[PDB]
């Protein structure tokens, strides 16, 4: 029916609203939600979560997780999430810069894999920030 | 109430008229300071001030006397 | 002091009346004797008192007895100089004293009058073979409850009074009831306050604390025990407060 | 001198006041830690629900997992969680001796032992020692809330994906009792397919031994009490739809559990 | 020496109604060496006198001038010798200062105390800034009632720990210039009345606004 | 040491110096028991500044050459007030405390910091 | 203390140890105070080590005199 | 032996005949109590008992002699 | 207590015992309030050695045998110096404290230790 948004970080509940239109990515790519979206279980990638209640769709980023958009519940377990406007685009670009520089210094193998992951998590930050 | 002019005393250690309130301290904590502060507060209301110096410098008595002079007390 | 002593001593040796001899205070008599010996030029004892401190204190502290005729009970103030309980004057005075009641600024500032601290105050007369096992056990349980309250004073504030266990919640509840029942409306402080004065015998006292502490009157408001004479007037005030709270 | 004695007595009284106040401060910090772990329970509990839904739905034969494959131990990653502050009794020294014993045992098995020093006292201890293998000195300055958990997650992820430091085991002090607590060793990696915390050698289910402790007062003094209400997952309508192959979906899910376990361990040690 | 001091001190007291209601406050001074206040002449004068205003050099160096020791100082005359306005504000002032005196050993831990004791620390911190005075600048009872009211009500939590002195002196001058009903009210009645309370609240917020626009 | 006599700047700087030293001494034994890490930012700050001020109130005397080894420096009141204003405001808040030891002026203390900084680089 | 100072030494011992007493007292402070701080900066640590070397130098056995050459 | 009749003393501190033993303590610790205890415990043994009271309170001495009269000891 | 009289070994072990007991006397003020837990590795080492030392100094006497019940031991210099050499070398660091309390020889101390490990 009309589904509820209770996303949550490891220690608290980041956003516990009951909103209309929710469009979040996944491992396979891009998906979305309309109210009464069928029983599903999707592990959302490190990808922005635009969230549209009636008037506003303010982009709420996240560093990856798992969603369950089933019967009257849309719960997104996320290792860490931080909304768009909340992070400022200037320091966001600064982190993007130093992260790309660390990817330049990615000579080691495990160093390179963690560089990729940290870069992409810092990326979706900026991807939600300035918009 | 004998208004001494100090917020701390006039609130927390109220002194009266006919009360023998002791001032006690170490060297240079402001004993004579509070004394002159009270005496100089009591210009307004009608009291006679007495200041008895025992064994002090004539220069210190000169300072306090000149002070009361330029103050009007 | 000897003048006051003999004027009291007549009142019980001839008239056999229970006299009260207030001496305010003992330390200043001790130092006045010290000054007399100093003027007389007799060699001083330890830290500066007169050599006859013990004998001089005896000459005044052994006319205060209960003879076959009457009894002089001496309720004398004592002062400890340099915070010594071991200075000769406090030591000699305590060698004679039988019970000490200690008044605290805490209970005065709060409003439990009189301001006696039931823990700092002690008596050697509160032995079972003197006061009765029932009095002794009720006093012991009251002291234990009030002490546990002092111990929980910091704990309860942080923990929240609900997070306490049931036993400790009972303890703090009954401790508040007891500490409030310790208040009394005085016969001579009615001029200031407006509460009539009251007299409470030990029967009323022991039974009141038995009822409060035995969990039986554990269903009364805190204020229903405050500045009240006995447990009967406590129940009366409690019914008044409950009727006043309904409407 | 009388002045000197009065001064030293005023000093000892100042010390008594300082420490007595520190006691209440530490009690309030314990209370806030308790209030944090009860709020952190929904994440791990809902994830255990969904994660044991997984071994009921895929029937455990549809797994090919990076964070579960056992490559035989050749280099080990033992994580030392040490408190940052001091004057905390011997809480630091107890685990900085437990680590010595554990390393002296497995030092002939796991020829290279990788210590991960999380904290501040460990970061002093291992730099004082002649350079035990240390990947990233984890210390706390605005990190311990979330960035520390996430950073431990990133480090163990990068270390486990290139499978050389297998058998990752972290060392912490689950505050079972307020008076006594000893440094436990819980195998976090390789993550088990079912949500049972891996004990010594990974062979013991620790779902029952794991507890949440809350503050109260036995008749005399305040003391912790062990409190638990836990069940097993229901089916949660296994008609649920996977957006991808459940193999890759659980590969994307296991970092969440890997994060939550580390966060709760850093709350337990705290 | 006790006989000497007792005769000299007790020569000064408040005479009765028939003899003229004359009085004579003795404000004696004794200097104490190395804080040995239980020495001979200190214990003599402390025994004979009614009150004791105890001055401490550790407060004196710390800036809190006049350096009186508020926890040690006593006066067995007490609030009897206070103006009614003064006692109305002084009760609240003494309770606040007792609270901050208890919480003194919690100021370093102002990062993880509950916000209530944090705010008690804040109030006592501002109240310490209140009580300091310049050298030989005595105040009148009405200005002191102004200051203690501004403090005790809670009107200095905003301004930082240092400005408080300058704020309060500006407050007193602004009240003096622009609401001359307050001092007249207290001079006539010597009682803090709700009319002067409202007038002081108004003047206080006015001065606060103009001072903040500075 | 009264405002009308010594100037408001001299009085305020004297009062601030005495305040920081008194804070330091009221804190010193608590630190000696507890440790130094556990203090707040401003507490550790004032401790460092007060140690540096305790160093800077030292001076090589003209006659104490046989005792110190350095030459005595006459230090003027303007130089003192300026140096203590700087050390209290925290301009020099990264220099070595030992650079403030047996120095006359404050430029001498800066130059001694330079000398110790170069000596460490060699 | 010594109320004569360098005038109770020679030019050589004065050149080598004029400032030594003040520096050694200040290092006694620096080594006595740096037991509270957990980690030290390198300049202070090296001064502390040199002061400890200085403290090991001043040990003199019984019935052993040192000449002025050995002292310098 | 001089059987003091007290468990702790007869276990740890055996007091024999002709041995000068000290009873030292604070005010109100039980020194007179143990004294009366030991004197009463010499009812069977042949030893006669002596008790002196240097500067004690008259009520205390009266209580002591009254207890001794009550026991008949 | 001078080497010219007593031998260099005796003198050296006496100086080392005096050193370690001095260091423990210094750390007493700290440990009174804090406990042994807050000390450094070398500090806690010296404190443990000083406990063992100040207990090994104790010896039951023949004339105190009526109060202690334990037969007094006679132990001269040849065993005194050796025992203390061992305690300050730290070979006997595995032993508890009560093994050195009220014994004459370091061998009797070790035998008492073996008893304290026989009583599991
Ligand atoms: N309330 C105060 N505010 C600012 N400065 C003060 C105050 N009280 C005293 N002082 C300063 O302290 C100095 C000492 O004051 P004062 O001479 O009154 O102390 P004292 O107790 O009389 O000294 P002594 O005991 O030596 O006679 C004065 O120079 C004065 O400037
Ligand atoms: N073993 C005991 N059991 C119960 N009560 C005791 C015991 N010993 C002493 N008391 C009680 O303690 C109180 C003090 O005892 P006692 O008179 O022996 O002390 P004291 O040392 O003589 O006092 P002081 O030092 O003032 O002379 C007495 O009232 C007594 O009843």
Numbering used by the authors:
A (entry chain e): 1 to 131
B (entry chain B), H (entry chain A): 146 to 218
C (entry chain D): 250 to 496
D (entry chain g): 43 to 312
E (entry chain B): 291 to 504
F (entry chain E): 375 to 496
G (entry chain C): 364 to 435
I (entry chain F): 375 to 494
Quote what the paper states about this structure.
ATP synthase is a molecular motor that converts energy from a membrane electrochemical potential into the high energy phosphate bonds in the ATP molecule, which is utilized throughout the cell to sustain its life by hydrolyzing ATP to ADP. The CF1FO enzyme actively synthesizes ATP in the reduced state, whereas the oxidized form has a low activity. Our cryo-EM reconstructions showed a complete view of the enzyme complexes, composed of α3β3δγεabb′c14 subunits, in different redox and rotary states.
We further focused the density refinement on the F1 domains, which have improved map resolutions from 3.0 to 4.4 Å. Our resulting cryo-EM densities imaged after the addition of tentoxin were overall well-resolved, corroborating the highly mobile nature of the reduced CF1FO. All three rotary states of the active, reduced CF1FO showed the density of the bound tentoxin ligand, and its binding site alternates with the rotary state. The percentage of the particle images of the reduced enzyme consisting of rotary state 2 (27.3%) and 3 (9.44%) are higher than in the oxidized enzyme (rotary state 2: 20.7%; rotary state 3: 5.26%). However, the reduced γ subunit does not maintain the β hairpin 1 structure due to the disconnection of the disulfide bond, and the β strands of the β hairpin 2 are shorter than those of the oxidized form.
